[PDB]
Amino acid sequence: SNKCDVVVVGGGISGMAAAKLLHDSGLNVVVLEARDRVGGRTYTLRNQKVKYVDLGGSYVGPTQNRILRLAKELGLETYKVNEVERLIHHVKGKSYPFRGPFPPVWNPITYLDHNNFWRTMDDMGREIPSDAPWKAPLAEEWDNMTMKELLDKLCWTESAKQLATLFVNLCVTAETHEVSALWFLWYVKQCGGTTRIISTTNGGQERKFVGGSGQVSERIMDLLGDRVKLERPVIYIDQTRENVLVETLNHEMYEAKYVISAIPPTLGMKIHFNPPLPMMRNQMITRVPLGSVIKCIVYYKEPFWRKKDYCGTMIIDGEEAPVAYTLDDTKPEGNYAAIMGFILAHKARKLARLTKEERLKKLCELYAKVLGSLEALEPVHYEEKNWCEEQYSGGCYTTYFPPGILTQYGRVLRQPVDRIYFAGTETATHWSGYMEGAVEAGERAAREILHAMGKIPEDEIWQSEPESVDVPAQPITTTFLERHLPSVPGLLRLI
Amino acid sequence: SNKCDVVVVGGGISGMAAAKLLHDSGLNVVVLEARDRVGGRTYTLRNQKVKYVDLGGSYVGPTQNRILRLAKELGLETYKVNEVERLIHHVKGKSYPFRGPFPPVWNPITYLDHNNFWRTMDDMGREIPSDAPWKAPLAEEWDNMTMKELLDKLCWTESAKQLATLFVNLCVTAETHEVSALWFLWYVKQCGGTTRIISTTNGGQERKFVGGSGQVSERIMDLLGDRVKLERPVIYIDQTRENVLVETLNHEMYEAKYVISAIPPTLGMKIHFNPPLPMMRNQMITRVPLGSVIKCIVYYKEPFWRKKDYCGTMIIDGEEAPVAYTLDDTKPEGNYAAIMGFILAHKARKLARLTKEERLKKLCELYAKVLGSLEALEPVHYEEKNWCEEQYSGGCYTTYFPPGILTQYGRVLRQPVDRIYFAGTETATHWSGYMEGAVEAGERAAREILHAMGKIPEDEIWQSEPESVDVPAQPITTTFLERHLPSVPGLLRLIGLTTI
Ligand SMILES: *Cc1cc2c(cc1C)nc1c(=O)[nH]c(=O)nc-1n2C[C@H](O)[C@H](O)[C@H](O)COP(=O)(O)OP(=O)(O)OC[C@H]1O[C@@H](n2cnc3c(N)ncnc32)[C@H](O)[C@@H]1O
Ligand SMILES: *Cc1cc2c(cc1C)nc1c(=O)[nH]c(=O)nc-1n2C[C@H](O)[C@H](O)[C@H](O)COP(=O)(O)OP(=O)(O)OC[C@H]1O[C@@H](n2cnc3c(N)ncnc32)[C@H](O)[C@@H]1O
Numbered sequence A: 001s002n003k004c005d006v007v008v009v010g011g012g013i014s015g016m017a018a019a020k021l022l023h024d025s026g027l028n029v030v031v032l033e034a035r036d037r038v039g040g041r042t043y044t045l046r047n048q049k050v051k052y053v054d055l056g057g058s059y060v061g062p063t064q065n066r067i068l069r070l071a072k073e074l075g076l077e078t079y080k081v082n083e084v085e086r087l088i089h090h091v092k093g094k095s096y097p098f099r100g101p102f103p104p105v106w107n108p109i110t111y112l113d114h115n116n117f118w119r120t121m122d123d124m125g126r127e128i129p130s131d132a133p134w135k136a137p138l139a140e141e142w143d144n145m146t147m148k149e150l151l152d153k154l155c156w157t158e159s160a161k162q163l164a165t166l167f168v169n170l171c172v173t174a175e176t177h178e179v180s181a182l183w184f185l186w187y188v189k190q191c192g193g194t195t196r197i198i199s200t201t202n203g204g205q206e207r208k209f210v211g212g213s214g215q216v217s218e219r220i221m222d223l224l225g226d227r228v229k230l231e232r233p234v235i236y237i238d239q240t241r242e243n244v245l246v247e248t249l250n251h252e253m254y255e256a257k258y259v260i261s262a263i264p265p266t267l268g269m270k271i272h273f274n275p276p277l278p279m280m281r282n283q284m285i286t287r288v289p290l291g292s293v294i295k296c297i298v299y300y301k302e303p304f305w306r307k308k309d310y311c312g313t314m315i316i317d318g319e320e321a322p323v324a325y326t327l328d329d330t331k332p333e334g335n336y337a338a339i340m341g342f343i344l345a346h347k348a349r350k351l352a353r354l355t356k357e358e359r360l361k362k363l364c365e366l367y368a369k370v371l372g373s374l375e376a377l378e379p380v381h382y383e384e385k386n387w388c389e390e391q392y393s394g395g396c397y398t399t400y401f402p403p404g405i406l407t408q409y410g411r412v413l414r415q416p417v418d419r420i421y422f423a424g425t426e427t428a429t430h431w432s433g434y435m436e437g438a439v440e441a442g443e444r445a446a447r448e449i450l451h452a453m454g455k456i457p458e459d460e461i462w463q464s465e466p467e468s469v470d471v472p473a474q475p476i477t478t479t480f481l482e483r484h485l486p487s488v489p490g491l492l493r494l495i
Numbered sequence B: 001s002n003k004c005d006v007v008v009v010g011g012g013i014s015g016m017a018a019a020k021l022l023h024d025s026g027l028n029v030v031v032l033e034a035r036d037r038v039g040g041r042t043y044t045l046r047n048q049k050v051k052y053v054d055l056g057g058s059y060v061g062p063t064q065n066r067i068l069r070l071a072k073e074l075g076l077e078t079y080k081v082n083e084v085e086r087l088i089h090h091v092k093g094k095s096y097p098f099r100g101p102f103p104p105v106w107n108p109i110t111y112l113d114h115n116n117f118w119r120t121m122d123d124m125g126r127e128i129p130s131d132a133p134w135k136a137p138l139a140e141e142w143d144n145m146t147m148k149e150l151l152d153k154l155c156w157t158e159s160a161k162q163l164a165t166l167f168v169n170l171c172v173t174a175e176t177h178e179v180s181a182l183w184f185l186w187y188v189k190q191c192g193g194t195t196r197i198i199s200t201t202n203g204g205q206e207r208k209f210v211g212g213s214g215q216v217s218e219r220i221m222d223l224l225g226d227r228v229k230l231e232r233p234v235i236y237i238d239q240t241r242e243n244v245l246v247e248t249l250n251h252e253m254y255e256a257k258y259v260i261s262a263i264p265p266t267l268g269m270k271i272h273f274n275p276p277l278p279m280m281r282n283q284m285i286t287r288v289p290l291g292s293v294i295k296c297i298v299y300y301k302e303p304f305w306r307k308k309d310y311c312g313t314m315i316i317d318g319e320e321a322p323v324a325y326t327l328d329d330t331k332p333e334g335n336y337a338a339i340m341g342f343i344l345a346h347k348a349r350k351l352a353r354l355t356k357e358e359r360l361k362k363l364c365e366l367y368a369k370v371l372g373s374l375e376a377l378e379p380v381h382y383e384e385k386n387w388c389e390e391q392y393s394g395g396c397y398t399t400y401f402p403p404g405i406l407t408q409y410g411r412v413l414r415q416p417v418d419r420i421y422f423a424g425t426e427t428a429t430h431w432s433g434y435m436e437g438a439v440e441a442g443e444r445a446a447r448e449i450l451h452a453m454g455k456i457p458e459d460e461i462w463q464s465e466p467e468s469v470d471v472p473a474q475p476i477t478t479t480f481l482e483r484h485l486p487s488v489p490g491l492l493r494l495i496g497l498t499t500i
């Protein structure tokens, strides 16, 4: 057997961040990675046509201080996603350009309904503990409803319900009827609320890494050398003896003091456990699917949309459109002009039966309509990735919780099982679902082990992160009218 | 490698029925079973205090002709569960004895609401094809609602909503808010509807096997001999070469022409696939949990409840009650008197924290109150099994579908993946979730392979089953009033119109 201090299962950002922290503390770590690459739900493809492209997780922004610090230490730089010109909201077959993060509305009833929807998402979130959403005062009530039920109650207009639906589909790559209202409300609040999660400027989509986010995992693999074992899917963990035994599919055995599980929760099902897992974890890992998305990048000769004072952001309502959301993916130098779009949730499943060339035609025709430009019909290149097909991800971006699961099983997610500690972005308390949450959870799991070893005190397990000097956060603000305008039923109670 | 025609993954009733059919057809089969025993979600415990007891699946009944036929061919016999005396419905801390399968209501408005609830479940079921529920005309609308939402729309009384809640909890070991309305309506219709699924006499809970249901899998293992490999959990299936390669945890390799996967769909996640599964199955097997249940059997000196004209059936509403449903589990000889009860859904999670002795105490106190009998506080023995702890089951009785999954992913549940065919009760079209459905699916998967091999024509893949001569099925009937009485909103519309 190969003997080490800690085996880390998974070489995504979380497992690499955990392995780096333990290595830096002087422990002998091994990373066992199922794939022939590191990075997991991050994947940067390089070729002459694109230079580089993120086909998985890409964006970082203010308040994501851990991923920004880790990347800076590994030598990476960010650049800003283009948001100089106007965003577009495409509604009932017409483009409405706008500025500011929230698509505006002009009808006064629709205005009250939209304002109340976003305000209510944040009001509900203020009662949900980031580190324990099952402790929300209405946890059971909210966990026993889907987001479809909540939007049916809250939205008096079809306009608000359609945009709220798009919000859920885009944020969590899942239908409103698939997901728990408590879990969705927690998910938004633990990113800093509605404005922060939906924003490019001053929010989650502000920046990308120069050369791709895959460099985070690749550069930690560079540091660790042959401590990273590629094509070593873990099949078996045995905790019955003095040392933990970890077996891989290619017949290798690893012996360690402790294990970090840095894989999506449900992919724990791919490991046979001795002794069996405790009942609550045994069932939990069958109840926590990942969402569905195709990330598609269409390349053009120039960023032609900018000539029409459009930044390349499109928010596209309705069933017919394959893509509900796009961002400008042009490189910081103005070259490799491109539009990134997502095919979300049921559409990822519906449109997966098409060929790559058929998806490209649908996207170009959509973009030609929304940007009002024939130039959209002349792509020079195309790259896409359907994350639903990945055996060792299960989907993207993250794990969602169907109704009833977070209150019954949520407490299990980061509970250690003897000498197995749990990392992965699903176990974070701030930007869970993101690269930021991956770093938080991997470093916290590593520090749980250092505490178990008697190397650090209990109060050092959870550590605050200084604000980035390069990407400072501006405050989220609201107006008097936003805070105090009535809801639609509120306007009716006054009549 | 060990070479054969067909590797069957899983030695539950479904894999064992598949293996038996293939063996009987002259093929070389191997069964790879993870556990040190066959039977899976069936498990018959034998000891001197109980003689035998089913801690997993137990009951069979009219219309379950495949399991009856298989068991009969293996030399097994059935007996009837005791339903001679009155059933009890316990609600708001009082017991109401009754006869007939449905707990009755006297309040006229409540009666309309109850009648309409059961009628509507079956009316909706008649829109849903057993072999393709996603083809129901309103499949998307019904799949995008939980059963909680459906009961909130349908039940105009708390009485009906509370009974309907217990019905879902007991039938599918899940909460109403956990499960798709389309899936639940399918599940009930593919068992023959509300009356058949809830009934003891003339329904699913009519009979048990003398000596236990585990004998089905055990007697097939006896016929197959050393073809059944115990403690062989499958970890890897490789279809990249001319023969399929199947690898076990204990480092054995099996080579076959075809594979039958006879495990619960989500337990396919325990296998690494080369090439990877197609996208739809890859995601489906992360979306289909099994329910939660502890099956608990309390033994007594005598079946004392019969002396009070109670058969031992208790239908118990109330968050405080650990157990929502019981049956008499006395042996057919009248000895080893016992009450079987289920701890369902969230209660199986909440009460798993307790010791075995603490659960026995809570159950005895409950039974004493419901039966009005101090004798219930004098148990002589106790057996239980929490199925939520089983690595190689995932839960019991069966797999449930949360909202949105059956329409998006249901088409791939029994779609072959190259040379992998899918059995297991979850893939059945009649009594899916039951031992009957295990037999249907195992035999159908085996015939798909016989067809692939050119041994049988396509029209022999799906085969009807002659009715049991031992267990005749009475038809499900309704009265004129049951068919035509209005719902509560129907009555309100009649009132509004009159007064006009
Ligand atoms: C896919 C995706 C993700 C995504 C996104 C868009 C798409 C299409 N957009 C994002 C964004 O713009 N910004 C952001 O911060 N995140 C975004 N995301 C999500 C992000 O990619 C993920 O949150 C993060 O990458 C998750 O990291 P984590 O380290 O927690 O998880 P992982 O990447 O899935 O890594 C797990 C690794 O484990 C290996 N594995 C799996 N099973 C085994 C076994 N049995 N044995 C050994 N290794 C195993 C996987 O192969 C993987 O490398
Ligand atoms: C648990 C339970 C079930 C049950 C019930 C009450 C309880 C508490 N009441 C029932 C009843 O009264 N009447 C009835 O007809 N059914 C009832 N059920 C359901 C019933 O037990 C199940 O429907 C039926 O037994 C399912 O049979 P099936 O053959 O489809 O599935 P299985 O029994 O789960 O068998 C699967 C086997 O596969 C092995 N396994 C799992 N993973 C692997 C791997 N990787 N490799 C090899 N073998 C594997 C399992 O160990 C099992 O033996």
Ligand SMILES: O=C(/[C]=[C]/C1=[C][C]=[C]C([N+](=O)=O)=[C]1)C1=[C]C(C(F)(F)F)=[C][C]=[C]1
Binding pocket: A059, A101, A102, A103, A163, A164, A166, A167, A170, A171, A172, A197, A198, A199, A204, A205, A315, A327, A397
């Ligand atoms: O929820 C939103 C965006 C999330 C989001 C989450 C993860 C990853 C990414 N990304 O990679 O792009 C975007 C949103 C929503 C809206 C709105 F208002 F239309 F609903 C307008 C803009 C953005």
Ligand SMILES: O=C(/[C]=[C]/C1=[C][C]=[C]C([N+](=O)=O)=[C]1)C1=[C]C(C(F)(F)F)=[C][C]=[C]1
Binding pocket: B059, B101, B102, B103, B163, B164, B166, B167, B170, B171, B197, B198, B199, B204, B205, B315, B327, B397
């Ligand atoms: O749905 C019911 C019972 C299913 C059921 C399904 C599987 C296995 C078993 N079992 O082993 O006991 C019982 C039911 C429901 C009622 C009612 F009406 F109260 F809801 C009254 C009696 C029975």
